Amino acid sequence: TDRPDHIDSRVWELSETQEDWITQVHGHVRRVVECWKYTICCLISNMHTHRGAPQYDVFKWQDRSTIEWICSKKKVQYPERDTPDLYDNERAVAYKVLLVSDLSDHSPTSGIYHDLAFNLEGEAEESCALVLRGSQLQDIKGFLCRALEWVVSNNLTQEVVETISGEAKLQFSVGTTFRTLLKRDTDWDVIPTPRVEPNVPRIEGRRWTQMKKLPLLKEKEGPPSPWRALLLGADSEYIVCPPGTDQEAISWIHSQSEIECIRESKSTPASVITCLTSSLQSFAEGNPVRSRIHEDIIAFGINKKQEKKQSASSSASGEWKRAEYQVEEMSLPPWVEEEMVLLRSDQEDNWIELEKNAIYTEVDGVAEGLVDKYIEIVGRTKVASVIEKWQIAATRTFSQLHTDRSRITACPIITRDPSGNCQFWGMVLLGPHHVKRDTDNAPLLIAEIMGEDTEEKYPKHSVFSLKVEEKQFLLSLKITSFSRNKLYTFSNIRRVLIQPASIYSQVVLSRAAENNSLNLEVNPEIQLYLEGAQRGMTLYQWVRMILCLEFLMAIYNNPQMEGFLANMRRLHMSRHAMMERRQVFLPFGSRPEDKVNECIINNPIVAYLAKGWNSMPNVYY
Amino acid sequence: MNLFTPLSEINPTTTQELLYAYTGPAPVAYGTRTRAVLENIIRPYQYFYKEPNVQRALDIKTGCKEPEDINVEGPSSGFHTASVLKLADNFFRKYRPAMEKLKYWILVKLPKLKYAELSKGRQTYSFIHKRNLPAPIALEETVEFLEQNLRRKIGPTLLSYCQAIADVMELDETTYETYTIKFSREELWDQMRTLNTMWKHLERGRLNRRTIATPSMLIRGFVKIVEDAAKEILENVPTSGVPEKLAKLASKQTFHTAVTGELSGDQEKFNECLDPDAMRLMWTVFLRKLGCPDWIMELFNIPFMVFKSKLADMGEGLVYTKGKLTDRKPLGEMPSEFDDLVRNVVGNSISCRLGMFMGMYNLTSTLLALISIEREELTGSHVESSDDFIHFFNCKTHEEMFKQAETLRLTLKLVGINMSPSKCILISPAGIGEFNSKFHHRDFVGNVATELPALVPNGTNPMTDLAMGLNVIKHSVNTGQMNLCTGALAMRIFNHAYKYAYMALGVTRRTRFMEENAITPLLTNQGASPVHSFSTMHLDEVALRRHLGLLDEETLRRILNPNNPVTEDYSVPSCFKYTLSHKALLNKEERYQRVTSIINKLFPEVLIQEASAPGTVRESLKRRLELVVERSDLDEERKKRILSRIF
Amino acid sequence: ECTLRALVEEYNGACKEAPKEMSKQFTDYNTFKRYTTSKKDHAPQMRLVYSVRKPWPISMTPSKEIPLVFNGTKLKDTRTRANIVVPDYWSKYGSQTSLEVVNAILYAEDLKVQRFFSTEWGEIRYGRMLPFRKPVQACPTIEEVNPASIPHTLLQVFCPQYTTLDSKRKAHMGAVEKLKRVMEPICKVQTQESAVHIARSLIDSNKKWLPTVVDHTPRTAEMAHFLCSKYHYVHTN
RNA sequence: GCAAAAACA
């Protein structure tokens, strides 16, 4: 409650936080009793002098560090939980102040410190009288009677007696009002006591049906899915330029080329080429960032939101209804197989430059040999070059994102072959990109060198002709807006190499486990279901197409793809189980194919994986 | 997909790691979460009766239902009270040591819990500033609120904090003070009840985005108490998904003339079919059969009753389109598919008595499932973590196995668990299964990560970034997710990314400055050749270079100097361990920083243990400063002059 | 004393400009150790590239031994900020320190390096091993220390005057002497936070789940990432 | 235009 009158204030806020009184059974009474004990200590340790310092020093409610100091100076050491209340330099004895119900039944607590006994109305044990002096006894009697009159005034005799005879007990109390608040939304009390007898009923259930044949996925019907990715993939090419810096190569390309459009898309107007030529020469003279031209307005979507809002406000009318979004279902495009067969094509260079780690032991040598051989087998492939292109483009675009600008920045995609020459894949132009949040979409105009054009595959791209030293190339311009998260993710696209490598190692090491001898040159016969027939092939080509699939899945990752993969892990497990002559049983209303089919809407690689699953046998003998 | 399914030299289980979308952008949730929140809230009401009747379920307080009401051909929300009682009693009779350890935790460790651990929580809704603040700020403001409105100092223990909350709930009027925030018992009750909902970001493996809810700081102490008790129960039972257990069951062998099957499955609408009153009954049975006092039962039952009265925030509005226009409108203004819940709208929040939310009671739900497992005729091996489970049946007959599987499904339905039929697969001769991203095939359990390691520097400083990247790769190797080749390749990729991020590649300002001033590259972040190898992941960068002679002694003395102006992570302090980089909150921040700065100098022991030492900060600092001054073995007059200035 | 005087006006200044801050309980320190307004970002690695390239990346304490401009290149912002090349500058034309300080700081890290290079490797055996993850102590320690007594052991080493007899009793006597004789060059007001970390790692016996083909001694546990795997096993003598 | 059940421009 509040401060008792007989207890001094300073003692009260000293005792305020010595112990957590609120979670004690009689915490207020215990606090008052402790205040009594400390006050008795203070009146015992009144102003005195033994040899220049008071003979009585107080240890109660003092910081343990100073108590330890004072004990060290006196060559004594007391435990924390049995520290005496006070210490006397007269006899050099530690006294603990105790309150007891009666004086006759009082035994010493321990031999390491003496006990001062009081009976709550002033009288003290004869040991106290022999130890202390008359004035101290009179003062303690006065304080004790002034406390006892307070106890009788508030009728706390039972609580005081309980506090004296025992230690603190823990509790947690909930009042009536909070209890009524708790009981508002439940049919039971705070401690639920339902009257029903504990019993578990017998409930009729359905049966479990065997999955005799594997589920067949549904191929969607509709227009074929166009190529929807940040860059071009297998159709990307590069222009060979004389050795030098990026600026020299850009100047070489700009000064010795001309652009004429051959295919124009409404999504990417043919006028936006004026932007690209404005950023080439600007980069040719050493300025990666240029000013704003008129053609940028329709190329980077500047002030598009306000115009769209104005048009909608001035045109739309009727009655408010729910959004009811929809996603257009699309079929498997023919270009996925072409992308697969082209991404694995052999290359003259390695395209995978990674600094070798150190070697200190033979395990390190084994690991480095495995990594080097994997780099050899998946390096001279088109997919590796496209991975490096994506890495460079995403990295250079991401490095220019955080710095807020209002001007167009050019980020050339240039690689160095192991001969010094420059390889120009394209140029990505970044708009104002007032990116406030990590999911905000920065505008981009991507010009990229093509290998072959296809209106069906690239409906939103604008294809121009490019003449450099009597050499013909295709230049594709695409207007996109792309997020910082996705650009950062594709700036570390090289991690896609991890998943195939695992498989490769998991084969090679396995062969070692078959003979306790590493080979690092094994190219075993992996048997697969190809074109609907069980036939074998080499490990290297299989790893190459695994890397092609993983790259395609990575660049085409979306909620549909992740849902499809997560729900297809179960079907893959079931198929592997049915290879091993194991039966698969299924719940009553169970259709594992439904979860997968929910995820097959318009993702070209999800559809490609679905077709690959459907081409395999659905029944095993 | 046929390319991912080998038929020789390797099995599809090992190649199932290829069915993962690493190195690709994780889906991000855009715009309003109102539709997802409302759908999550409305699922339990449509699932209470076999024939959907939302109106008749919207006036149900306790989700208790008869066995005939249970939907065996579809999801069922609610529980059978007698079933919960008997199952909890059976779960108590078994697992005696686990409940003994719970008793020990209650008697000993529970009173010693400090509410300062609440400061280590994640984002909270501030009922004072009406914003989202980090856990330390919300904890500090809540403690100050309790101090002001309760006129006593809150003890460091968690029980003291909970008692303070329960006491402040008894006041007609509370204030916060200039601000002068005016409250009420009903307003504070609503603040306690309200759950703040948000999108679950960076979530993979799902077509549709999910939502996660946070409780208020007022109820978080009780939530932590009950969840800690749940941890102590779950860590001591063989059916929990926390250690191993999957590997142990995989290694288990059964005689030939037996039928062993393996059911791998998930749970549909795990949080949309669980009622907090079942958790109340389970906990009450546990504590009552443990012999705990009534205040223990009250303390354990408060959180779930506050959850029964939850006011989960329903986002920022449903999307309505007139023509090409788009608008956000709260539930109730115009007809929609959630009109049935219009009667439950309280301001921008909606009342919901049935159903849970994700990220609220992850372990009590697991406990409920595990007590549902305990039955006389379920003589199998069950391991469940949240909504994922694996079960091993060892029966003498196929019909017996099917009976046990159906009994398992029904007994989980008795409390509202509802395994998804399409996501549950039972392999008949066992030996193949999936559980918690771990694939079991023929007594081999392979761990597959949901997320690939970032393989990029974390962003603190070169030394810690290198150490943490190497530690992450080493951990991935230890879990089995990576091997020799993958480990070394990941190391090379991380080395390239680490060198690029610190301008250690090509020609940059840093490399140009090093070249002009003739500063040879001696560290990996400086452009030197990597010294770390596959076998050297735990070794420090500064070390292993002095040992190999790559770093002579005087440059070590130059860079290891503690007096340099710039200064588990086992990286030695060095000059390269640098640091890169709300009206009345920044001044309070800097004041608290200064107070923390005067400590850690006068109080070395807080660098090893907790603060303890009851008393005011000013008085403790003054006393310790004195103790230092007159333990400085100086002259007495100098000591007197020094204490003369302490005021 | 000058250094003791350096703890007075800071106390008086803190008590003056932050009155309500000192009025809080001393146990509140455990709460406001981490009191920060800054939101806990979801991915700090995203902005590292920008932060490093940002002008004046490093925040440095005020200093005099680092020039404002060195060889026609700005270093400090004249707390002040530092150029990205400042740590590179300090590696060649900086102030050295005692060899004992270097040895003490690198202690418990050079020990791991010495253990790695003082052990012999057997031939790699390839087979169908079954690595089962078992909880073992991750790193070898100078002396075996019961957990929950590590904080009491560290108190004796660093602040034996601010302790209790109860803490003294349940502290590993025998590892304190080893810690004192190897940490005393760095047991000052500076590197007090650091020296605790090295000392803690010296006697920390935490358990980690590691692949196991044969039962791991503490020496082999810290290097278990290459001793065993699904397909290979190397024996250590 | 990005994108996917609703946000960026």
3-state SS string for chain C: CHHHHCCCHHHHHHHHHCHHHHCCEHHHHHHHCCCCCCCCCCCCCCCHHHHHHCCCCEECCCCCCCCCECCCCECECCCCEECCCHHHHHCCCCCCCCHHHHHHHHCCCHHHHHHHHCCCEEEEEECCCCCCCEEEECCCCCCCCCCCCHHHHHHHHHCCCCCCHHHHHCCCCCHHHHHHHHHHHHCCCCCHHHHHHHHHHHHCCCEEEECCCCCCCHHHHCCHHHHECCCEEEEEC
Question: Can you tell me the distance from the alpha carbon of C59 to that of B567, in angstroms, rounded to the nearest whole number?
Answer: 9
C-alpha to C-alpha distance for B23 and C103, rounded to whole angstroms: 42
A269 and A240 in one domain?
Answer: yes
Decide: B254 and B371 in contact? Cβ < 8 Å.
no
Residues 6 or more apart whose CB falls under 8 angstroms from that of A202 comprise none
Q: How many residues does chain B have?
A: 647
Chain B nearest-CA residue for C95? B558
> Has residue A65 been placed in a domain?
yes
Name every residue whose Cβ is closer than 8 Å to that of residue A571 and which is 6 or more positions away in sequence: A214, A215, A592, A593, A596, A613
Which of these, C162, C167, C166, C131, lies nearest to C151 by C-alpha position? C167
Residue in chain C nearest A507 by alpha carbon: C231
CA distance from start to end of chain B? 77
- CB interface of A with C, residues 458-517, below 8 Å: 484-485, 488, 509-510, 512-513, 515-517
Chain A nearest-CA residue for B426? A585
Rounded (5°) CA angle B637-B641-B645: 165
In angstroms, rounded to a whole number, what is the distance separating the alpha carbons of residues A149 and A155?
Answer: 10
Please indicate, yes or no, whether residues A336 and A481 belong to a single structural domain of this protein: yes
3-state secondary structure B34-103: HHHHHHHHHHHHHCCCCCCCHHHHCCCCCCECCHHHCCCCCCCCCECHHHHHHHHHHHHHCCHHHHHHHH
- Please, are residues C137 and C207 in contact by the beta-carbon 8 Å criterion? yes
**Contact between residue B53 and residue A186 where contact means Cβ atoms under 8 Å apart:** no
Way it was determined: cryo-EM
CA atoms of A93 and A79, how far apart (whole Å): 15
Cα(A265)–Cα(A190) distance, rounded to whole angstroms? Answer: 69
CB-based burial label for A303 (10 Å; 0-12, 13-18, 19+): exposed
Instruction: Please compute Rg for chain C using Cα positions.
Output: 24
Half-sphere exposure of B480 (CA within 13 A, CB side): 23
What is the least distance, in Å, from the CA of C227 to any CA of chain B?
9
Contact call for residues A327 and A367 (beta carbons, < 8 A): no
Chain C residues whose beta carbon lies within 8 Å of the beta carbon of residue A80: 164-166
Cβ of B2 within 8 Å of Cβ of A555? The answer is no
Task: Decide if C235 touches A, using CB distance below 8 A.
Answer: no
Name the H helices within B350-434: 362-373, 398-413
- Cα–Cα distance between C144 and B354 in angstroms, integer? 53
DSSP three-state, residue B263:
strand
Contacts of B534 (CB under 8 A, 6+ apart): A357, A363, A364, A367, A368, B484, B487, B488, B491, C225, C226
SS percent in chain A: helix, strand, coil, step 5: 40, 15, 40
Residue A175 identity: G
Residue (of B564, B535, B537) closest to B466 by Cα position: B537
What is the per-residue burial (b if ≥16 Cβ within 10 Å, else e) of B67-77? beebbbeebbb
Characterise A197 by phi-psi region: left (phi > 0), alpha (psi -120 to 50), beta (else).
beta
Given a contact cutoff of 8 angstroms between Cβ atoms, the answer to whether A391 and B505 are in contact is no
User: Which domain-ending residue is among A435, A468, A491?
Assistant: A491
Contact by Cβ (8 Å): C24, B588: no
Q: Which of residues 192-211 of B touch strand D (CB under 7 A)?
A: 208-209
Instruction: Determine contact, residues B411/B372, Cβ cutoff 8 Å.
Output: yes
Nearest C-alpha of chain A: how many angstroms from B564?
30
* HSE value, Cβ hemisphere, 13 Å, CA-based, for B440: 24
Q: What is the Cα–Cα distance from B536 to B551, expressed in whole angstroms?
A: 17
Write the CATH number for A124.
3.40.91.90
Rounded Cα distance, A217 and A600, in Å: 9
Do A152 and A244 lie in a common domain?
A: no
CA distance A79 to chain C (A): 6
Last residue of a domain, one of A118, A142, A164: A164
Contacts of C195-199 with CB under 8 Å at 24 or more apart are C195/C104, C195/C158, C196/B607, C196/B608, C196/C154, C196/C158, C198/C104, C198/C105, C198/C107, C198/C108, C198/C109, C199/C154, C199/C157, C199/C158
Residues 521-560 of A with CB under 7 A from strand D: 558-559
CA–CA separation, C233 and C130 (whole Å): 10
A114-118 and A93-99: which strand pairing?
parallel
Residue type, B489: L
The two structure tokens encoding residue A492: 């570390």
Residue A357 lies in a domain: no
The rounded distance, in Å, linking the Cα atoms of B355 and A295 is: 55
Q: At what angle do helices A335-343 and A604-615 cross, to 10 degrees?
A: 90
Q: What is the DSSP letter of A256?
A: T
d(CA B509, CA C53): 9
Among left, alpha and beta (phi > 0; psi -120 to 50; other), residue A9 is: alpha
A331 contact partners, CB below 8 Å, separation of at least 6: A219, A220, A221, A222, A223, A224, A225, A607
CB A192 within 8 A of CB B281: yes
- Other Cβ atoms closer than 10 A to B634: 13
Residue A557 and residue A472 share a domain: no
Residues 6+ apart with CB under 8 A from A175: B166, B167, B169, B170
Exposed / middle / buried, residue A208 (Cβ in 10 Å: 0-12, 13-18, 19+):
buried
Residue B113 near residue B138, CB atoms below 8 Å: no
Cα A547 to the center of its chain, rounded Å: 27
* Two structure tokens written together for A291: 């000013």
**Any domain includes A118:** yes
Mutation target vs C (from B617, B621, B631; most C CBs, 10 A cutoff):
B617
- Asked if B493's CB is within 8 angstroms of A194's CB, the reply is no
List of E strands, B278-333: 318-321, 327-329
C236 C-beta neighbours (distance < 10 Å), count: 12
* A591: CB within 7 A of chain D nucleic strand: no
A449 & A540 share domain: no
Per-residue tokens: B333: 């203004």
Return the residue matching tokens 């009025």.
Answer: C23
b/e map A95-127, b = 16+ CB within 10 Å: bbbbbbeeeeebeeeeeebbbbbbbbebbbbee
Resolution (A): 2.5
Provide, in whole angstroms, the distance separating residue A227's CA from nucleotide D6's C1'.
23
What's the Cα-to-Cα distance from C106 to each of A184, B531, B540, C90, C210, rounded to whole Å?
A: 63, 17, 9, 18, 26
The residues facing B259 across adjacent strands are B395
Chain-centroid distance of CA C166 in Å reads 27
Q: Which residues contact B299 (CB under 8 A, 6 or more apart)?
A: A172, B159, B162, B222, B225
Residue A360 lies in a domain: no
The DSSP code sequence of A497-562 is: GHHHHHHHHHHHHHHHHHHT---S----EEEEEETTEEEEEEHHHHHHHHHHHHHHHHHT-SHHHH
Supply A534's token pair.
Answer: 């069980």
* Contact residues on chain C for A401, CB-CB shorter than 8 A: 50
Q: How many CB atoms lie within 10 A of CB B151?
A: 8
A269 and A393 in a single domain? The answer is yes
| Nearest-neighbour CA in chain C from A504: distance (Å) | 13
- Which residues form the domain of A238? 233-302+329-345+381-491
Interchain CB distance below 8 Å, B601 and C189: yes
Amino acid in the structure at residue B345? V
Q: Domain spans of chain B?
A: 462-559, 599-644
Same domain, A395 and A420: yes
Query: Looking at the structure, do residues A568 and A469 belong to the same domain, yes or no?
Result: no
- Chain C residue with CA closest to B634: the answer is C1
Q: What is the CA B34 to C1' D9 distance in angstroms?
A: 24
Spell out where B163-238 has E strands: 196-199, 211-214
Question: What is the pairing mode between strands A441-450 and A422-430?
Answer: antiparallel
User: In angstroms, rounded to a whole number, what is the distance separating the alpha carbons of residues B364 and B282?
Assistant: 9
Same domain for A457 and A538? no
Q: Are A481 and A513 members of one domain?
A: no
Spatial contact of B195 and B223, defined as CB atoms under 8 Å apart: no
Contact A122, A140 (CB under 8 A): yes
In this structure, which long-range contacts are made by residues A77-85, counting pairs with CB atoms below 8 Å and at least 24 apart in sequence?
A: A77/C165, A78/A112, A78/A113, A78/C165, A79/C164, A79/C165, A79/C166, A80/C164, A80/C165, A80/C166, A81/C166, A82/A110, A82/A112, A82/A113, A83/A59, A84/A59, A84/A113, A85/A37, A85/A38, A85/A41, A85/A58, A85/A59, A85/A60, A85/A116
Task: Give yes or no: residues A507 and A487 share one domain.
Answer: no
**Which element (helix H / strand E) includes B493?**
helix B484-501
Q: How many structural domains are present in chain A? A: 3
Note the maximum CA span of chain C.
Answer: 71
List C136's β-bridge partners, or say none.
C208
B412 within 8 A of B244, measured Cβ to Cβ = no
* Alpha-carbon torsion (B41, B44, B45, B47), positive or negative: positive
Of the candidates A543, A504, A508, A530, the one whose C-alpha atom is nearest the C-alpha of residue A383 is A543
Residue type, B340: D
CA Rg value for chain B: 29
Instruction: Record the tokens describing residue A505, joined without a space.
Output: 């190692």
Contact B494, B469 (CB under 8 A): yes
The DSSP result for B23-37, as a single string, is TSPPP---S--HHHH
Which two three-digit tokens encode residue B322? Answer: 């007139």
Which residue in B545, B539, B538, B507 sits closest to B523, CA to CA?
B545
- Mark which of A143, A164, A185 sits at the end of a domain: A164
Task: Identify whether residues A478 and A513 lie together within a single domain.
Answer: no
Q: Which residue carries 């690092």 as its tokens?
A: A520
